[PDB]
């Protein structure tokens with residue numbers, strides 16, 4: 211939680227300030243898997259950032275109207291939702 | 306160096322009058338190689354022609370806007386630059402001033418070449434040949450990219466720059482499209498945002514001067530009030546002479562601008578005329594003549610019309626002013642030509658008649674012309690003159706005139722202006738950007754009396770390492786851009 | 797409109813001479829507001845949206861240029877015609893009204909034989925009518941034609957949004 215990552219006016223890049231969010235928003239479908247299913251310390255998928263955003267929220271914010279960005283965000287969103295449902299069905303991340 | 310090769314009008318082909326230039330411009334990547342690497346007598350790559358052009362200059366001149374020609378010139382230019390760097394790195398061929406004193410970038414800008422000019426403006430290479438690069442990329446952390454374009458010989462700080470050459474020296478039909486490209490757009494936008502205060506201060510000062518002029522001209526001759534009138538008069542005279550000095554200094558400094566495009570600005574002439582009228586009106590009032598009021602009122606009108614020059618400094622109004630100018634120059638003078646022909650013909654026709662009876666309307670040419678213009682303005686007096694013996698002839702002539710003018714000409718003019726407005730939509734934005742760029746360049750230079758100190762924008766950011774020892778420095782213009790098409794291909 | 801109505805009633809209770817202006821202004825504003833309700837139809841809401849879009853897009857630039865030209869020419873004419881050889885162009889209000897008459901379709905373009913600057917006044921009037929009655933108004937017609945052509949589907953979308961808000 212610094213200044214570059216914060217969503218503001220100027221030089222910035224917002225990704226939810228979380229390693230899993232950084233991987234997902236970066237189109238990195240491999241390290242996200244390892245972080246999810248690393249036996250040493252699996253990363254909780256419902257952990258939030260300072261502003262209250264979650265991984266899905268972070269995926270939403272960086273979304274734009276560019277066809278390529280829209281496709282990337284759609285694919286990552288769907289895949290992450292399916293995976294999260296497969297890990298901990300008891301919690302609805304959409305809410 | 307004869308007649309066919311020399312760049313002129315007629316049967317001609319220019320290739321720099323050098324065998325290597327002929328080979329390169331001819332798309333012959335083989336004999337150029339042999340000439341460069343022939344052991345018996347290698348051909349120097351920095352040898353010039355009579356005009357001072359070099360091989361790169363020759364490649365630039367023959368460049369056109371055709372996609373195939375642009376691609377050919379781009380490929381040959383890049384390959385030859387790489388080869389020259391590989392042969393004699395100690396000499397930078399990109400910096401070779403010909404007789405006129407221009408480099409390939411400056412020459413490409415002046416000659417109107419856009420494709421090759423833009424390609425030279427923003428080009429990048431791999432790790433090898435990296436120094437031969439204008440565009441760079443510091444890091445690509447995430448989807449953002451931080452580009453750093455070189456600002457050597459393109460910034461306004463230099464005595465001669467690409468911005469100045471495009472603004473005041475280029476005479477291409479659509480040079481206004483050369484100021485919308487990458488940091489010639491962003492750089493100009495930054496300069497404009499930094500210089501807004503100067504522009505609006507100038508606008509406010511001019512408005513104050515015009516308001517004083519109006520007040521003096523309203524409560525003018527036909528104690529305290531007399532002293533106020535006198536001080537207003539002296540202030541107006543001082544303002545007029547100061548405007549005259551400024552405009553004369555501008556013309557003296559840019560005296561090689563009018564022949565390129567008189568109508569590009571066409572506003573400095575108006576300011577000069579207004580100042581001349583004001584000063585001359587004051588002098589003739591000193592002479593106590595009856596022609597003081599006409600000149601003074603004409604100056605007042607011209608100033609209040611000139612204020613549009615300042616009001617076109619906004620996105621929403623500059624485009625409207627540009628459209629006004631384009632319509633005026635495109636389709637309003639043909640309409641006037643046809644209108645005056647018809648009006649003079651019908652006016653003299655009506656004057657010839659109505660001169661034989663069985664307050665005389667159509668007594669002269671002025672009266673008939675005024676009546677016809679009243680027809681055109683919406684107050685046509687179309688009656689049945691029962692006094693003159695040619696009632697029917699006069700009535701039919703008036704009906705024919707109104708049918709030919711009030712139905713065809715004016716409504717057709719409406720339609721033609723609709724078409725013209727539809728045609729010029731994006732060109733309006735480009736021309737507005739060019740006008741704003743010219744205003745920025747003029748403001749950057751100080752007034753005719755105060756020598757404004759130059760502000761050399763850009764960051765002295767060390768880029769890469771040249772093929773030498775101690776490293777190099779180069780001023781650049783940082784530009785951040787969020788891109789995913791390029792970022793998705795870096796993985 | 798509600799503020800004007802209530803305040804007009806209060807000032808009438810005060811027995812002032814400014815009751816009629818405020819009351820009539822309220823009446824006019826209400827009759828104009830009725831368009832809010834009339835734009836509840838497919839065929840009329842789009843027209844109202846187009847009216848608003850044209851007003852906001854290209855009618856204020858025209859007014860800016862118009863008022864600049866009109867004030868300049870009005871004060872110019874008032875300065876003249878003040879020296880002879882019912883005085884037209886007596887003040888600024890009269891000259892402005894005469895120019896607006898030119899623009900509305902009842903321009904009084906005559907040869908004033910009384911003032912000593914006949915030709916100057918006539919040429920100024922001719923220049924004004926040429927610059928305003930030919931360029932500005934017909935150009936405004938063309939610009940509104942372009943604007944109407946531009947906003948066709950956006951008009952439907954904005955009408956749908958307005959109906960959703962209602």
Ligand SMILES: NCCOB(c1ccccc1)c1ccccc1
Pocket residue numbers: 575607610611613626629630633
């Ligand atoms: N001469 C006053 C300013 O020029 B304008 C004009 C009027 C007189 C002569 C030629 C042109 C005009 C053109 C564009 C914007 C505003 C008006």
Ligand SMILES: NCCOB(c1ccccc1)c1ccccc1
Pocket residue numbers: 825828829831844847848851
């Ligand atoms: N003020 C009356 C209603 O607004 B309208 C209008 C009139 C006065 C001030 C500004 C706008 C108008 C715009 C669209 C539809 C109908 C008329």
